[PDB]
Amino acid sequence: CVHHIKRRDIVLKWELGEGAFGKVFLAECHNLLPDKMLVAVKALKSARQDFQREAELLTMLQHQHIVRFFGVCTEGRPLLMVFEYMRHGDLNRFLRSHGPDAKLLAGGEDVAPGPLGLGQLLAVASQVAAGMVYLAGLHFVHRDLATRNCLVGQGLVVKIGDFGMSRDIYSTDYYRVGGRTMLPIRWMPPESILYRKFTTESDVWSFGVVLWEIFTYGKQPWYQLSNTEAIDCITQGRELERPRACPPEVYAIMRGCWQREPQQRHSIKDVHARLQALAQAPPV
Numbered sequence: 138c139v140h141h142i143k144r145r146d147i148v149l150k151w152e153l154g155e156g157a158f159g160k161v162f163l164a165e166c167h168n169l170l171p172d173k174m175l176v177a178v179k180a181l182k183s184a185r186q187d188f189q190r191e192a193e194l195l196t197m198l199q200h201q202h203i204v205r206f207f208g209v210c211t212e213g214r215p216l217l218m219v220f221e222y223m224r225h226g227d228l229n230r231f232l233r234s235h236g237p238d239a240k241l242l243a244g245g246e247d248v249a250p251g252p253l254g255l256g257q258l259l260a261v262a263s264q265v266a267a268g269m270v271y272l273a274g275l276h277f278v279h280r281d282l283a284t285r286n287c288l289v290g291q292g293l294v295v296k297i298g299d300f301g302m303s304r305d306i307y308s309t310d311y312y313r314v315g316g317r318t319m320l321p322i323r324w325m326p327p328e329s330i331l332y333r334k335f336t337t338e339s340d341v342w343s344f345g346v347v348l349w350e351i352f353t354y355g356k357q358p359w360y361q362l363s364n365t366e367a368i369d370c371i372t373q374g375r376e377l378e379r380p381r382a383c384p385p386e387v388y389a390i391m392r393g394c395w396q397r398e399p400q401q402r403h404s405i406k407d408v409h410a411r412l413q414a415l416a417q418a419p420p421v
Contacts, residue, residue, distance in 0.1 A: 139192050140208030142166070142219055147178060147210060153226075156302025158182055166219060169207055176207065177223070179300050181216040188216050198277070202268030204288050204298025223296065225289035228261070229307075229355045232284060236354030247292050252354075257293065258382065259416035262351050264295040266409040269344055272297075273337050273405050280335045282343035283324050284350045285310060310357065312364040323358040327372050328399060338399035344408065345394025352380040352387065384420045 146167040153161045159181050166176045181188060188211075195206045210217040225231045225245070234243040235253055242250045253261070265287055272279060279297070285307045286299040304311050304319050311319040314330060326342040328334045346358055358377055359367040376395050379388040390411055393403040 139196055141212075142169070142208045142210045142217070144210050144212055144217075147217065147219070149178065153177065154300065154302065154306055156300070156305035159300065159302060161300045161302070163222065166207070169219075175222040177220040177300075179218040179220070181218075185211075185216065192218065198272075198275075200268060200271040202264050202296050203271065204296045220298070220300075221290070223288035223290040223298075225293075227299070228265075228284035228287035228289050228295060229350065230285075231289040232351065232355030236356075238354070252382075255382075255384070255419040256416060258351055259387075259412060259419060261293070261295050262348055263409065263412040263416050265297060265347055266344060266405060266412050268297040269340060269405045270409050273340070276337075278335055278337060279340050279343070281321055281324070282340055282347060283310065283321060284347055284355055287347075312368075314368070322364060322371070323367055325371070326395075326399070327374075327397065330368060330371060336399065337405070338402050341394050341402050341405050341408065342399075344405065345391045346377070348387065348391050348394070349377050349380065349383075352383040354382075386415060386420055 146169065147164060148167075149162045149164045151163055153163050155161070159179050162178045162180060164176055164178045166174045169176070192209050198206075204223065205221040207219040207221070209219070233239060235248075235251060237252070244250070268287075269279070269282070281299075281303065282297075283303075285303050286297065288296050288298050290296065310321055310323065312322050314320050314322060320330070322330055324343045324346045326339055329339045329342075349358060350356065359370060362370060374397055376392065379385070379391075390403075390408060394408065396402045
């Protein structure tokens with residue numbers, strides 16, 4: 138059941154991001170854990186209904202690699218959801234800040250500036266896969282797996298989670314297929330793009346693309362192509378090229394995720410195992 142938090146224990150510092158349905162803030166939460174504490178707060182703008190359902194949903198989803206939900210404040214307005222603060226923001230931004238295109242050098246005291254090591258890129262992937270293993274186990278279908286929708290905390294702990302506003306912060310990553318719903322086409326398999334079928338196999342395909350993002354420091358997939366060009370590529374069975382950073386045994390894991398027949402795609406469980414393995418013993 139849902140944990141509740143007193144508005145007086147929540148003190149906003151400043152806005153972090155914004156969508157058409159909410160703002161996210163950085164803030165301090167008193168008396169949350171045995172104290173004074175940094176957290177992320179989603180402030181919401183019929184509505185109070187979906188909010189309640191969603192609040193219950195993400196109290197059921199507890200796992201070492203799912204962003205931690207602390208509770209809600211429904212006492213008055215606006216409706217607040219409280220999450221653990223992940224100091225490095227979304228995984229996409231974290232990756233780009235350690236890429237070769239990065240203008241300014243990345244700061245912080247918990248990770249070195251510049252390119253990550255193979256071991257580190259691998260553990261990043263393994264941590265996301267771990268969270269996807271969990272979800273699959275609950276027959277939960279994510280539908281929008283991308284590095285933009287993972288978060289990175291203290292010490293490079295990586296967790297799946299977002300604040301429901303990626304379509305606004307990262308609109309370039311969504312396209313109205315057929316002029317209908319905004320979909321993250323570059324992360325989608327043909328059956329999802331063509332027929333809007335979203336499954337566990339759909340998610341493993343997306344994980345394949347996440348691996349690619351990870352080994353390209355967050356480049357957008359098919360970044361040289363327009364949305365219609367990307368749809369054509371994916372539809373015809375063109376696969377993203379192996380990244381320069383990427384060793385063959387890792388690229389083989391990607392291609393496993395990109396089997397055209399959904400049932401031919403390796404399970405998330407296997408992908409996780411082969412990723413942990415490699416992280417422990419990174420090839421050359």
